Amino acid sequence: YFNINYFKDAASSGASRLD
Amino acid sequence: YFNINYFKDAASSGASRLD
Amino acid sequence: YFNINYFKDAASSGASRLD
Amino acid sequence: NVGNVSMYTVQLGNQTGMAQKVFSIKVDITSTPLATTLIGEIASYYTHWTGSLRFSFMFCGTANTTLKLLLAYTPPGIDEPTTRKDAMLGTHVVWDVGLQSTISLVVPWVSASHFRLTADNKYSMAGYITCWYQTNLVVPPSTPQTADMLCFVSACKDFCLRMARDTDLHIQSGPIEQ
Amino acid sequence: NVGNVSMYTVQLGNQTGMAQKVFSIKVDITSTPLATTLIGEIASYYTHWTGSLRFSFMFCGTANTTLKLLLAYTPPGIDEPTTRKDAMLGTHVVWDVGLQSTISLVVPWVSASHFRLTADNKYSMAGYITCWYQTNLVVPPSTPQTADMLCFVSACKDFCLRMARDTDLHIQSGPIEQ
Amino acid sequence: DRIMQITRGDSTISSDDVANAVVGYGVWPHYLTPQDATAINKPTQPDTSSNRFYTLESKHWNGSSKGWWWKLPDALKDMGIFGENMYYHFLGRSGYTVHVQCNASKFHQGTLLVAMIPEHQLASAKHGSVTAGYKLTHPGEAGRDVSQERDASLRQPSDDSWLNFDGTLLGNLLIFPHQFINLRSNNSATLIVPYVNAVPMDSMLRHNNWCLVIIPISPLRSETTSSNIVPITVSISPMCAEFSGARAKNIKQ
Amino acid sequence: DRIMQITRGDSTISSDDVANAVVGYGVWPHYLTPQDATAINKPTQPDTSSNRFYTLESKHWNGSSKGWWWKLPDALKDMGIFGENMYYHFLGRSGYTVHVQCNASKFHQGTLLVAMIPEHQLASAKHGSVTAGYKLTHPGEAGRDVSQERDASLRQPSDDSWLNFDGTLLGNLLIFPHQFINLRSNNSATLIVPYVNAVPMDSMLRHNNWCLVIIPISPLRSETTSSNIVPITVSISPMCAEFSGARAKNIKQ
Amino acid sequence: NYIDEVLNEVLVVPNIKESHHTTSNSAPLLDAAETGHTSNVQPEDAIETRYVITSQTRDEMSIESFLGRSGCVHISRIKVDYTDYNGQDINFTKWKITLQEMAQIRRKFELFTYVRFDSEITLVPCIAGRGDDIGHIVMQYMYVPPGAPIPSKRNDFSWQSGTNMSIFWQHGQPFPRFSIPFLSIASAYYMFYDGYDGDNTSSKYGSVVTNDMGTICSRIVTEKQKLSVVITTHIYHKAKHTKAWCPRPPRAVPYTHSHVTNYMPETGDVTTAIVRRNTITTA
Amino acid sequence: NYIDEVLNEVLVVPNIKESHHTTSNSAPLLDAAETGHTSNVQPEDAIETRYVITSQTRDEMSIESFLGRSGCVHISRIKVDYTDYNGQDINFTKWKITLQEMAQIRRKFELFTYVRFDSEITLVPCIAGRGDDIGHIVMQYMYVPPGAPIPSKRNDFSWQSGTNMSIFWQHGQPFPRFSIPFLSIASAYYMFYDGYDGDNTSSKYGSVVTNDMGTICSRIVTEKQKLSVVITTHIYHKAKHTKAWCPRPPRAVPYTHSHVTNYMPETGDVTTAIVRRNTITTA
Ligand SMILES: COc1ccc(N2CCN(c3cccc(C)c3)CC2)nn1
Numbered sequence A, B, C: 001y002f003n004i005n006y007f008k009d010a011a012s013s014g015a016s017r018l019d
Numbered sequence D, E: 001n002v003g004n005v006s007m008y009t010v011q012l013g014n015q016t017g018m019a020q021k022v023f024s025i026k027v028d029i030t031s032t033p034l035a036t037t038l039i040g041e042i043a044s045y046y047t048h049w050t051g052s053l054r055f056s057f058m059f060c061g062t063a064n065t066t067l068k069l070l071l072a073y074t075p076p077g078i079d080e081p082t083t084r085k086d087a088m089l090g091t092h093v094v095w096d097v098g099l100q101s102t103i104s105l106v107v108p109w110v111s112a113s114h115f116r117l118t119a120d121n122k123y124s125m126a127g128y129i130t131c132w133y134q135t136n137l138v139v140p141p142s143t144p145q146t147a148d149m150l151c152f153v154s155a156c157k158d159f160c161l162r163m164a165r166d167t168d169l170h171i172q173s174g175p176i177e178q
Numbered sequence F, G: 001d002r003i004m005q006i007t008r009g010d011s012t013i014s015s016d017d018v019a020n021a022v023v024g025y026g027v028w029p030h031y032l033t034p035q036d037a038t039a040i041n042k043p044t045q046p047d048t049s050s051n052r053f054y055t056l057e058s059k060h061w062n063g064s065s066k067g068w069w070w071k072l073p074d075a076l077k078d079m080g081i082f083g084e085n086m087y088y089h090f091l092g093r094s095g096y097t098v099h100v101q102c103n104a105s106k107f108h109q110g111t112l113l114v115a116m117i118p119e120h121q122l123a124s125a126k127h128g129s130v131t132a133g134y135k136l137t138h139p140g141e142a143g144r145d146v147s148q149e150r151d152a153s154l155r156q157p158s159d160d161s162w163l164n165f166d167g168t169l170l171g172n173l174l175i176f177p178h179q180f181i182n183l184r185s186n187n188s189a190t191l192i193v194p195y196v197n198a199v200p201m202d203s204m205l206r207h208n209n210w211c212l213v214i215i216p217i218s219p220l221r222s223e224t225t226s227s228n229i230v231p232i233t234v235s236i237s238p239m240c241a242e243f244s245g246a247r248a249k250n251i252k253q
Numbered sequence H, I: 001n002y003i004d005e006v007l008n009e010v011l012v013v014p015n016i017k018e019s020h021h022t023t024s025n026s027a028p029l030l031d032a033a034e035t036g037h038t039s040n041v042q043p044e045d046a047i048e049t050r051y052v053i054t055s056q057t058r059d060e061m062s063i064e065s066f067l068g069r070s071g072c073v074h075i076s077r078i079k080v081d082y083t084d085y086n087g088q089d090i091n092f093t094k095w096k097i098t099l100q101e102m103a104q105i106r107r108k109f110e111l112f113t114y115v116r117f118d119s120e121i122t123l124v125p126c127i128a129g130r131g132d133d134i135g136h137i138v139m140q141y142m143y144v145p146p147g148a149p150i151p152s153k154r155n156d157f158s159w160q161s162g163t164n165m166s167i168f169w170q171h172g173q174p175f176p177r178f179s180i181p182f183l184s185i186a187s188a189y190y191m192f193y194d195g196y197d198g199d200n201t202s203s204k205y206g207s208v209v210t211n212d213m214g215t216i217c218s219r220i221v222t223e224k225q226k227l228s229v230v231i232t233t234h235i236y237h238k239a240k241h242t243k244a245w246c247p248r249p250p251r252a253v254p255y256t257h258s259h260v261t262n263y264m265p266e267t268g269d270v271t272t273a274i275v276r277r278n279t280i281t282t283a
């Protein structure tokens, strides 16, 4: 389960990723 | 229903399997 | 909506079927 | 009779008169004497019933004995018939007692509402069934002159119930111990 | 004996009489002496048990020494046998002490219910096992005349448990400090 | 045709008149399968020498008779071989055939209701939580009731018929495998019954699986000399008997 | 290798030392064939529950011991199941396995001759035409002789060994199926024996087909405390038991 | 399946065909019920029937809609105490699992000899305020099979459930509801029994010999409080995935004691549902 | 997998084949247990067995269903004070993580030498009302590994958790429950140890040397209140994704002290579960 930005804005999202 | 590790980390998950 | 045995065990499930 | 077994037999008697009547019960399957019956006991677990029904009678008479009863189903509409002619007019079955022994009377389904209520209701009144002598009970010498007939009721493939509900026929004016 | 080690050995003795009896224990795997055993200790973590079981005995006797015991499994049904003949009638194994040293006795699974309860229950009574002399314990000159036999119990591939529950064999009438 | 012939051991029974035969729950009695099994030993299966036609003690049919029962695993606790194998083994399993004979003449009138019943937990005659006693639900060939008298000190069952002894209006009893003996057509009653129980093989001693009841419904009525006695005789045949869990031997009681 | 393992019922026997085993007349015991048969009924064949390893009463080996015998069809007239089926049936047929155990130490010296014998018609101890009595050739688990005392009023056999009890120089006895128990090598003796008799199935009561004898040849000699008792224990297993001619039940005697 | 299952038309009953008259030999209305069998006669046989296409399902007439319904089988009660907390056999309940201890439902089953099923549960704590404020009251319902440490009193060590099941409910959170297999041991639950404990002329005999699925102990955590309370955690039980073998006559007389069949009032010359008639002639 | 896993038929046991008699040389029933090995004899070997197709799973006999069950391992308590709020070492708890401080569960593990697993947690605050109204009482459970500022008293600065974990629970909201890896450091959790701190004849020695996974400090936010309270936030622990190496004998004697193996009552001449018999001859 993931990438389901339930919210529109980007500022709202999980902790970013890593690379 | 399964394998939906709603959480990122592995330490968080159901009781393992059997084999 | 159905057959989504959210729980592992079989003892936990809806009222069986009919046939 | 009631607290005993007899409460199950119906003795077919003398009858000085002729064309006399035996018994009657009403069809509303939740009505003592019916009720208590495996069926009744049950039906009383549902709010509505339907279909045909089957009444069977057996002669616990003798072998050399003979008789002919007339059984009848008087559909809902009027009063349980006072006389045979009046009752013979509707649904019935003449029963010839003989080498066989069991006559089975069917109770067709006559109703307005596809369905009837299991609970006492003036509307959903299923009617009456009664039994009378067609001829007599003749017995050759040195045979008893009264004998019994057992009666039963099983369903028809017609049959079906619905709307489960808790029973009538059992009040646990307890509790229950240990 | 019990708080010591001996509590583990069974000395095979003299026996003036013949065909005399050694010991007995009951099979209900949650019953001291059994219980405490790696198995028992465990089983007491589950509500139900099943399958066959294995009892093994070893001769801590001498080399020049000799004997022959008869071990038996008396299934559930009656009382632990008072006499050998009576017990020999059911499941058993004659054991010839010799160059080998270990005889293993199997306890078949005899029961009505595929499964037995781990908890003391008159119903799920597994039975008794007992040991007696077949011959004697003969020892040539200047050898002791009593000697010991150790006994053990391991499972069978038959075996299996279920319904986990908290143990019996351990009451923490504590607490526990620091 | 009504005539019937039955052969079970070294024994055979005939009946020039009958009301079919009945197979309990439409299943024919047979031997246990390695699927439903549980035990591990090889069962002893006495064939013929055991599952044969044993006849019990006879009884009188009175105008005062009330009814009499026999409990099967128990009725043959003495019947040779079967009834020894019973006592020598823990696990016992077997099905039966019940031949109920009761004749009189075509000038007689009477009706007997015969029925078998899985787990017939009887009720005590006395109010409370005291269950019927062993020794009284273990009568033997002889059966129980008749319309008899007895100590009320004994944790004694209900001699009570109409309630089914279990307190279920007799008459619904027709749900259990049954048939009648209407002296005007019938002569006997034949019940055949497989092994019913949540376990593959039970204790032939502690547990009686089948329970049989015979109850006069319409009272015997002749016009003859009461010198004319009309017995009721029961005959039984273990079928597909199987035993196991061999050992010493229990004890009679 | 000498070690041996034998499994017969729910029973097994072991022996960490042995002198082979012997099959009587080189024939292995089995069930009767529809060719040599004669009877017409279906024999009951208790398997396992019957043909299992029964052990008798034990005995003492004395420096004064003279010898002791057991008659087989008879030694198990009490051994559960087999020994009931015996009494319930007319015809009985069966073969056996004889495990003779007798240990002591490697510091002991002794020799036992074990032998089975088809039709062992014993002789009476008293001159005449009076044959041994029933009741005395029908001892039971317990066996006979030892070196015992008894009424001479009884049509009593010959307690006489060297003549074979039948009056044939013991020593020619080696013709019957046998083996010894030389305490210096041996531990047991194992005899296995089919059914020998001019008839397909005999009377398990009137006729004892096999007769077994054990005779001290070289007297037991230790240098130990006579607190050291060296028993002799016999164990037996009907094999391929088959019965038939079911009925009431004989009576014990 | 859907439609048939959503429309509930799985088990449908046949229709009543049309008939004509019969002046013929074979009389279907005549059979001999002594055979113990059941007649097979129908409308179409006895009368001059018409033609009715049916549409009644025998869905609700299935051992699963007959059985599969939640029923009070026990009412655990705790009249708390603050005076003595703990103490022996206090402020924590322990009732023996198995019905009987409650009617209605008990009667239902009993309609069959044997039986088997996974049991669904549901709790219904009801906190009665006997004080001027209860607040937060945690609860611990811990099941316990046989041979298991049953708490002597509240805070034993058995309430650690290191390997047992304990469900927790705190005032607010919805009603706990869990399930459960077919437990028992062999094949099915003995709806009766005609066996005993043993040969002991003092042994037990009844459907209490084959059913001892341990006990369940309650206990109200949260500890000592000011304003008192009393709890009544109701219990309902539902049978899901049920099975049935061999049926039997219903129970007309009001039960007695737990386990057992006994009928036998304190005089009540005994009593059944049957009503009395003046005469058979008029109904 | 499903079926096998849903039906729980993963680890099935073999069946018992059929046997016949054996009048043969090799005696399987004879082995010498001194070899330290275990016999391999079976039903089929010893008797004349039949044929039983089995159907018992050894699923529930897995280190995960043996271990994977929640158990009280600690009962944090706070008898609040309103008189002095803050003050040093008050109204905030701090217990040393690791079992022992609780039986049942402790005994379970100890069945093995080493071990390893992710730990699932669950809190169970229980607010006892000692006042005429509690209302809203926030809570802060903040974990703290080693070398970390442990709050001197309630409101330190360590309750900011700028980089620590603090779970918050407010009366109403369900029971908090989080997880946690295998922490430790090397490979697995020392279920025992036969090492010491050092050569100091005053060094430590036991399974308290290899396990110091810091401490966890509680603390009830919300500040000062009127009507008092007392809290008891229970603790349960479950082992998910567990492993096991090398087993060992269970613990029959009631433990002593935390850490350590010590057995040794205050006289109790010592005591074990073994029962006494009159005679070996009758059981
Ligand atoms: C005789 O058949 C039954 C009838 C009832 C029963 N119950 C069902 C309810 N159950 C249960 C219900 C709630 C809580 C706990 C621990 C157990 C116990 C067993 N078990 N077997």
Ligand SMILES: COc1ccc(N2CCN(c3cccc(C)c3)CC2)nn1
Residues within 6 Å of the ligand: I097, I098, I099, I119, I121, I143, I144, I189, I190, I191, I211, I213, I215, I216, I237
């Ligand atoms: C010896 O093995 C163990 C045994 C227990 C343990 N615990 C598990 C629980 N855990 C824990 C549980 C709840 C809250 C917090 C912060 C930590 C601490 C470590 N760690 N290692």
